[PDB]
């Protein structure tokens, strides 16, 4: 996961300060914070006094302080705070530009971004601008990866996606296929697709006529909620409205007809911001309108089959005939290598198969899952959850494509005292960050977690 939040912090301070100016932007970014960052930052919003880290170092009780160490590295990344190496301690205070920027919005703020949209008769119906918007997303979804009908008109997105090469298709031959990114795009359920899209919109439209901060207000104007009346009319900058028009063009904005009206608050914009229920000519049966067959029996058996929905499945299994109910096929360890023929590992498929086609595997996945979590300490025999026989069937299917091993971390040396090593030996076993180690070398290639927990046990 590219973790757009990492890009969010990636932007420098002044542009963050440029984004810190808008309380609505200050507001939206808050929900990204962990509850540590969420609650604790709220405190310094009010008591106007920089607090040295020693108080906060003292605030957290036993295990959970690593999140503070996670938090401090996190907040430095987006520079929401201002560290002060004043008195040998770390005299931490907020970045009020954001801190006081949101502080106004806390008690009925004057954040024009929050008030840019006009509350009016939000006449956008359930199916209206959602069925089309979902159909737009579905239509481009079929077109982008390659569906029976490619009705997606996002040429600029296609130019951006083709230029970004995220859709691994031969643009010279006009191919629009799911490459490593495109197949990885299948991994992104709802937001993830929009995230790379949001990144693609950011990456594509980010240099020429950027005005991103102004667009960001429009972005978070879309990100905030449904515009209702006067949205496009009033709350729309040149980039913001154009981006809103661009966002409205892609269906992610369910703008009213004629492209000139108040903001039509389609569900699409909220959903990527939501991370919640992902539910979207005149007939539509769901969720089980699309379904397939995947179980411990290792076979495909469909009684629903939605051509775009089943188009995803057929890329890693041979298909014989799309029945009225069925997509006739049988999964084989070679069949999954059809994805590996593209190089797509059946690794996203692990969760995906437990996620997708479940409309036809509600009973089977539930019989697989069997709620075997509370009984796990008591009963030690799991019921194929998640299917290890399939995993075994999957794992040795990869035997065709072999010979890769590497690991992430950092080189660690200059270690002298074994007591602490022995102390950390169990303490690392207590904290469980061990990819691999060896006392023969006292050297390992892992993250920086072990030092910080040793740092803040009894020091100050």
């Amino acid at each position: 996961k590219h973790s757009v939040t990492q890009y969010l912090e990636e932007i420098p301070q002044q542009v963050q300060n440029r984004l810190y100016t808008s309380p609505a932007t200050c507001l939206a970014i808050y929900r990204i914070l962990p509850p540590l960052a969420k609650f604790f930052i709220m405190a310094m919003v009010f008591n106007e006094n920089e607090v040295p880290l020693l108080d906060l170092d003292k605030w957290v009780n036993s295990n959970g302080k690593l999140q503070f160490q996670n938090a401090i590295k996190s907040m430095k990344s987006l520079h929401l705070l201002i560290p002060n190496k004043s008195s040998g301690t770390l005299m931490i205070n907020l970045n009020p530009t954001f801190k006081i920027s949101l502080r106004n919005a806390l008690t009925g703020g004057e954040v024009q971004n929050s008030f840019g949209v006009v509350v009016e008769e939000n006449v956008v119906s359930l199916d209206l601008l959602d069925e089309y918007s979902a159909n737009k997303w579905e239509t481009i979804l079929h077109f982008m990866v390659g569906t029976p009908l490619a009705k997606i008109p996002s040429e600029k997105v296609l130019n951006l996606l083709k230029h970004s090469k995220l859709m691994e298709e031969v643009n010279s031959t006009g191919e629009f296929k799911i490459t490593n990114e495109g197949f990885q795009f299948l991994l992104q359920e709802i937001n993830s697709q929009l995230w790379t899209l949001l990144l693609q919109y950011l990456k594509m439209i980010e240099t020429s006529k950027m005005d991103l901060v102004d667009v960001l207000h429009f972005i978070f104007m879309l990100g905030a909620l449904e515009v209702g009346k006067a949205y496009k009319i009033d709350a729309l900058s040149e980039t913001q409205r154009i981006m809103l028009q661009d966002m409205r063009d892609y269906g992610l904005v369910f703008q009213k007809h004629s492209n000139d009206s108040i903001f039509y608050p389609t569900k699409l914009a909220l959903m990527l911001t939501s991370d919640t229920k992902t539910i979207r000519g005149l007939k539509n049966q769901d969720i089980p309108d699309g379904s397939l067959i995947v179980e411990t029996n290792f076979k495909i058996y469909s009684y629903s089959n939605s051509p775009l929905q089943i188009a995803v499945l057929s890329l890693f299994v041979h298909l014989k005939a799309r029945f009225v109910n069925m997509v006739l096929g049988q999964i084989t360890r070679e069949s999954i290598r059809r994805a590996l023929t593209n190089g797509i590992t059946a690794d996203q498929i692990i969760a995906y198969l437990e996620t997708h086609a479940h409309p036809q595997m509600r009973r089977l996945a539930e019989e697989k899952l069997e709620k075997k979590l509370e009984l796990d300490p008591n009963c030690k025999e799991p019921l194929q959850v998640l299917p290890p026989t399939v995993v075994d069937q999957i794992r040795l299917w990869q035997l065709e494509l072999d010979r890769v091993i590497t690991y992430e971390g950092s080189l660690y040396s200059d270690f002298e005292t074994s007591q602490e090593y022995n102390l950390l030996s169990k303490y690392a076993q207590d904290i469980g960050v061990l990819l691999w180690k060896d006392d023969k070398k006292k050297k390992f290639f892992i993250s920086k977690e072990g030092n910080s927990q040793v740092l803040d046990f009894a020091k100050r």
Binding site: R403, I405, T406, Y407, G409, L411
Partner: protein, 66 residues
């Protein structure tokens, strides 16, 4: 606390022994090796060795499976 880090790749030296001169053939961006089971690369250029890692492995092998 100064760290002599690098783009560590841990494996057996077998195809790495190939990779050594092969790196010198592919301009050798695998920089540092404290011990034989290790390879450190240049972050802007890590994957180019791993490019032909596929290419050399697939050029003619092609899985005949008679």
């Amino acid at each position: 606390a100064r760290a002599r880090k690098g783009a560590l790749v841990q494996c057996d030296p077998s195809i790495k022994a190939l990779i050594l001169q092969i790196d010198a053939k592919m301009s050798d961006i695998v920089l540092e090796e404290l011990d034989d089971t290790h390879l450190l690369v240049n972050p802007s250029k890590v994957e180019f060795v791993k490019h032909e890692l596929n290419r050399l492995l697939s050029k003619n092998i092609y899985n005949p499976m008679d």
